[PDB]
Design a protein around this ligand. Sequence first.
Ligand SMILES: N[C@@H](CCC(=O)O)C(=O)O
Ligand SMILES: N[C@@H](CCC(=O)O)C(=O)O
Ligand SMILES: [Zn+2]
Ligand SMILES: [Zn+2]
Ligand SMILES: [Zn+2]
Lengths: 258, 258
Amino acid sequence: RTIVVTTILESPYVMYKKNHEQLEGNERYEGYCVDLAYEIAKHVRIKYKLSIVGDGKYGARDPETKIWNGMVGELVYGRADIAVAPLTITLVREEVIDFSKPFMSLGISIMIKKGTPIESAEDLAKQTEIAYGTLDSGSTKEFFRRSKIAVYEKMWSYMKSAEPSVFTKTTADGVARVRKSKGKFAFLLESTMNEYIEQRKPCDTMKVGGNLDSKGYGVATPKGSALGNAVNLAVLKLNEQGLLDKLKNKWWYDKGEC
Amino acid sequence: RTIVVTTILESPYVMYKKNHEQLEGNERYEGYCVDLAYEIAKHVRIKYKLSIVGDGKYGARDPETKIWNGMVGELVYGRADIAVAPLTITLVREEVIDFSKPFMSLGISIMIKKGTPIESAEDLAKQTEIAYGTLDSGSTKEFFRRSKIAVYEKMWSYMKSAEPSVFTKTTADGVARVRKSKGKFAFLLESTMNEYIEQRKPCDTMKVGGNLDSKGYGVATPKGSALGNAVNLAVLKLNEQGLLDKLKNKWWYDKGEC
Ligand SMILES: N[C@@H](CCC(=O)O)C(=O)O
Ligand SMILES: N[C@@H](CCC(=O)O)C(=O)O
Ligand SMILES: [Zn+2]
Ligand SMILES: [Zn+2]
Ligand SMILES: [Zn+2]
């Protein structure tokens, strides 16, 4: 009856509220996806428990074991009834889980420390002084691994062969690496996160160049889940009611700091 | 065996080739959706025949008869197996047909003749000298009809009762009206079409302001259609393989004229 909603602590989607340690259950969290979950749950008429994905990962199929990790894994292996998170709709994932229509559009973007002489993926690919990386177990890394576009193939080859790893285990780590690397690290991450971070103190990062691709986050459910339909309709309704836009404004721009 | 692909004559998605009268079948047409259908069909491994929707409409449900027209109707009533078209994914359509994940992201946008003193929906809403309208039988019109947001409600109220009609039967008609109206007509249409027209001579129109909303086109199939799955996976694959980006460039920007 209480459905398990897997999600990931990723600002501003799901964040601990400042006074959270005096709260329990869903009350502890706030953010775009918390609001989204609330709104979805309201329309799908379910009780739900927000559960932060144990491994902290979005989800990436180990090529050896074929095991899916992250929230995708939570869904695939029956541990969560629905993932409400900035979980990118991708082909390999759609093969194993269902996604609502996107509740957010985004693209892979480059985050640089302000003043970094990078304006594009091409700029990154044609040089080596500025290291770059992406989130592990995420759609962005897969994008590059799988890309047949020459420049991205080159970036992938660099990243894949980067030592130490230029793959981070959290977005926060990637952002931290950008911020601490005096311009010598650029982070490839989704424009949504990039933009949010760009608006948070210390305001020392920025998104550069256009998006490398265009995709969406969807609310994910186990393949064939009967929840999937209601959730999809809920997402479409929320988008059309302008709630998603309002939420985006509320969580990205309204509190903007830069 | 041959699946019927409904689509609509809407530049640059589907256009007659110059020598179309010499040609038969799919060869008659060219454009983004013609290329996309070709790629989708190749990847789904189906033979298909493009069939231009008779009523030249995207699809809306007549409140009286409850009859779906346009491409949505072609799918709903079993005359087409798939719609490959700039068909907006909407809640009401999703209730009657299936959509792939979006192959294009877009929003309602304002097309003005260059020089028109309008920079936003608010600018349009708060005034009457500049008439504005949208396509009939499309998601844009429904967006305004359905909107509970004051500005758009005001715009809807304006449009609903504007005389003569500010609603056009084709995008082309709306564009032509913008172009002919000396800046006294603005056209609310999807950013995609807006951006395309912006790139075409006489180069006298432009998209202004941000998009009013954010949504996507999906390749549509009849609810529960088996084809739906492969098509969705095809779209995801083509997206990730950069096809859609390439097609967008090919049909919008590469031949750009402005
Ligand atoms: N949204 C991504 C995670 C962030 C990224 O990979 O950039 C995913 O679902 O995997
Ligand atoms: N893409 C829209 C048509 C264009 C518009 O309504 O502005 C639809 O599917 O209805
Ligand atoms: Zn705590
Ligand atoms: Zn002709
Ligand atoms: Zn192909």
